[PDB]
Amino acid sequence: PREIEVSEPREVGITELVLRDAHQSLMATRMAMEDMVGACADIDAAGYWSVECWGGATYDSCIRFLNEDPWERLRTFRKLMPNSRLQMLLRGQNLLGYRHYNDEVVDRFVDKSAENGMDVFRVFDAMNDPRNMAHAMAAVKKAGKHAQGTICYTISPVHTVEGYVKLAGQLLDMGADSIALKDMAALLKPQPAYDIIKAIKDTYGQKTQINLHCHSTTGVTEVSLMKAIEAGVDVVDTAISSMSLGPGHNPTESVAEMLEGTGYTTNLDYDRLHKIRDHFKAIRPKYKKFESKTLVDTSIFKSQIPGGMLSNMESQLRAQGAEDKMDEVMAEVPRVRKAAGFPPLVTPSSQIVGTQAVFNVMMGEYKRMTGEFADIMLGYYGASPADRDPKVVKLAEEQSGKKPITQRPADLLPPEWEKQSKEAATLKGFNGTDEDVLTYALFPQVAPVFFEHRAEGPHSVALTDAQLKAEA
Amino acid sequence: PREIEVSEPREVGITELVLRDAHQSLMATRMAMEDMVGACADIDAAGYWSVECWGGATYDSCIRFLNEDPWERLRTFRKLMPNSRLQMLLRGQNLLGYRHYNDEVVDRFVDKSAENGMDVFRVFDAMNDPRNMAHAMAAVKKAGKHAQGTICYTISPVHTVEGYVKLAGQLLDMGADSIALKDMAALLKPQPAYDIIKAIKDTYGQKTQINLHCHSTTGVTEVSLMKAIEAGVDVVDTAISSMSLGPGHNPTESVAEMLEGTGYTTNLDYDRLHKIRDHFKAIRPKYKKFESKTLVDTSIFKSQIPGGMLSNMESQLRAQGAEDKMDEVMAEVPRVRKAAGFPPLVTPSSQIVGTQAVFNVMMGEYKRMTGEFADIMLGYYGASPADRDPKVVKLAEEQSGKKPITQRPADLLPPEWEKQSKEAATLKGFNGTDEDVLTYALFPQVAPVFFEHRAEGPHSVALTDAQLKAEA
Ligand SMILES: O=C([O-])CC(=O)C(=O)O
Ligand SMILES: O=C([O-])CC(=O)C(=O)O
Ligand SMILES: [Co+2]
Ligand SMILES: [Co+2]
């Protein structure tokens, strides 16, 4: 009489990702604001637990490609979806930028984000070092908003159910209002989803709120959602059907429909979901120039290498003739990752390990380390899940003259707001707001250009209706 | 302490659909034989329970568009995959044709199919009338092959778990070597999958072999596969990852990977699966002119109308100006189906009900019934799941002068082989084989043209490598 224990019948919450992660994963975050607003009213009345609509790569995209002010995008969504819990993805001490910042910047950014309407802050760190998440978290609590501590899921010799339960505890210990299990690479299998979700519930209590974010890259995560729901998961993330699958996510409608008769239910307005879906089915074709060309890829389960990392390393060897050695790089990546203490292979970690793998294949084993890689071995990105190869660490120290550190990298950073402020105020177009100063601090190289063109209004790099017909 | 009982740890069998249903669902059965053979050796060594590679719409496609002889395709697959159980889809008394045939034709077709290498015959009837399946089944047993009785899954007021358990019993009663639950529209939800699968096991025994065939049209069937496996399902059908999803099926690799740690396992050679996958990833782009443009559609759960039926009805109103009334037709379909005794909405049933719905919207309620629709109401397609509206039946009788029948439609059919033989032998190109006579009997209108051009060899209607680059 073999049996599985499942959570008591209950309503499961849904977080819609169409406005942020979905298009970031499917069309390089190129989705224009004018192609989104027409769906806000319906999304707002759909019945979602939260609506992910800011953060992640959208800040960069807004200013770099769309000549759009992120803060204006945030203000508009807040206005167009007044009844909803807006959600964002924030990479801890890196905020939405390229480097860790002094705490005062984190304070400023979070504060201005809450001030403009952000309700739920999913804070995460690419290395999974809770220290890098600690200040952002506190900042979110101070603004009286929902702080969601993030655990980046991954598979490696050092990652275990126990290790994740511990990390969860650390997150709760720093005031997490909830825990997000983030599986960007779709590495979370069904059984593991059930065990981890249950392990955390059994350990910290049923009251412990867990939100599961799984991409559908590998094709197995929708089954993992079911198992997570049986393990008692509180909220799962999805993407409206016309903007789903591939490197994207599981379909909202599908996740809602698959529960009928299980005892579990979602409570989303199906007719509203249908409008949201059609809205995007009409719009999506315009972005064909940015679609990925693969729907299902399970290779990562064996290679441990994500595609977005795979193609990139290829473009390096290809644009360097040694495109044949792609098999030697494939074998080198694991070794480099291990040397780095097995960090989750997500941006930036992924790029760093990828590029470094290429070097060891060509110029020889760590004969020359990038500055970024050296910074990882030396601790400037924080602590790794496992201890790093002391030998490779030493080399790094001998190739950069930098001294190893083991404490939160932000502890060494000096106040910078005043400096950033003065510098931003010298740029043509600057409007005086901290918002603008933050844009400059997060993107020194783009802020100037953006500030000068912003008055032109946001644009779109998607095909026009004209262009669509003119092709077909 | 809520709990679910799951089957004992065990190996689950997999049936690969890439060679038949996958391309029929994703690229209108246009897949050229030369684009397939290069994958046979690997598919043969993959470890699948069976390989669906013939039947369904491939016969028609081979002779109508590819100038290819189906029997030659069957002989080649048999040769290229000597170690595998080949499988086919056969629509009962209709064989792979357009009408029910006299038993002697069924005998001839099945016999020649086994003779040329077919091992597993999935026999099914669009109305789910076991009588229409009875003779084909027996014929398969006589050839000493595996007879798989099919239950076309659907949702309707008359379809219940009990109703399916009964149908299963009828299938076993006529010698079924196994039962196939076929969900062409991806209507099978997780709970129902578990209940039905278990209901049949609990009722006829664990020894009862059940094979589940779910399309991924609605996005919920991979979760249903898991539940079916927990309910004890023996074999599930999948499509190699590069030829999956959409109106197609769940990914083979994904289904294999999602089981890790559950106690269940598949035993497929992952490296072989990888070659099969790459083989088709390279080839698939050439068929872009035949792809569907939707990946996930849950609308059918509310409308009860499949897309392939939906678009067709639209092309009727569109090519007739009354494209506005598409909402009136949408409401009429349910009514017509009910009148017909709720048959599963799969070909031919779907087309018949669709077209008839259009008429009632225009010319008025059954003011004019098609001959096909009249035949359904009158019983010439067999028995319906539920009793048909006696009023609509009467009308049919008064608009066709045909008398209602309730017995197996084939009971009225006269011997025809001799007739078909003589007629086929008058065509230029005819080679004398029963195989050819069968081609003529199944496709009177095409056989002549095919026989005349066959010597040219099979062709492809897919883009060429040249054409691909010349576009991109
Ligand atoms: O999928 C995620 O949540 C991770 C993400 O977008 C990012 O790295 O910016
Ligand atoms: O999916 C199925 O098995 C049904 C099918 O192909 C057909 O109607 O020819
Ligand atoms: Co994501
Ligand atoms: Co099918």
PDB file of C-alpha atoms in Angstrom, chain B residues 56 102 109 114 144 153 217 226 234 244 282 306 365 408 427 445 460:
ATOM      1  CA  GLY B  56      -3.123   7.574 -39.219  1.00  0.00           C
ATOM      2  CA  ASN B 102     -16.780  -4.926 -46.036  1.00  0.00           C
ATOM      3  CA  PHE B 109      -5.459  -4.848 -45.130  1.00  0.00           C
ATOM      4  CA  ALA B 114       1.408  -7.720 -40.542  1.00  0.00           C
ATOM      5  CA  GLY B 144      -0.817 -13.162 -34.393  1.00  0.00           C
ATOM      6  CA  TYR B 153     -11.161  10.261 -24.465  1.00  0.00           C
ATOM      7  CA  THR B 217      -2.505  21.077 -27.032  1.00  0.00           C
ATOM      8  CA  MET B 226       2.596  11.687 -14.084  1.00  0.00           C
ATOM      9  CA  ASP B 234       2.008   0.796 -18.344  1.00  0.00           C
ATOM     10  CA  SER B 244       7.149  18.262 -29.485  1.00  0.00           C
ATOM     11  CA  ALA B 282      18.256  20.164 -38.080  1.00  0.00           C
ATOM     12  CA  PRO B 306     -10.920  21.697 -30.782  1.00  0.00           C
ATOM     13  CA  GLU B 365     -31.888  24.843 -37.613  1.00  0.00           C
ATOM     14  CA  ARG B 408     -22.900  -2.414 -37.153  1.00  0.00           C
ATOM     15  CA  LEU B 427      -5.035   1.730 -64.092  1.00  0.00           C
ATOM     16  CA  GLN B 445      -9.560   9.402 -56.478  1.00  0.00           C
ATOM     17  CA  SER B 460       9.326  16.351 -50.595  1.00  0.00           C
TER      18      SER B 460
END
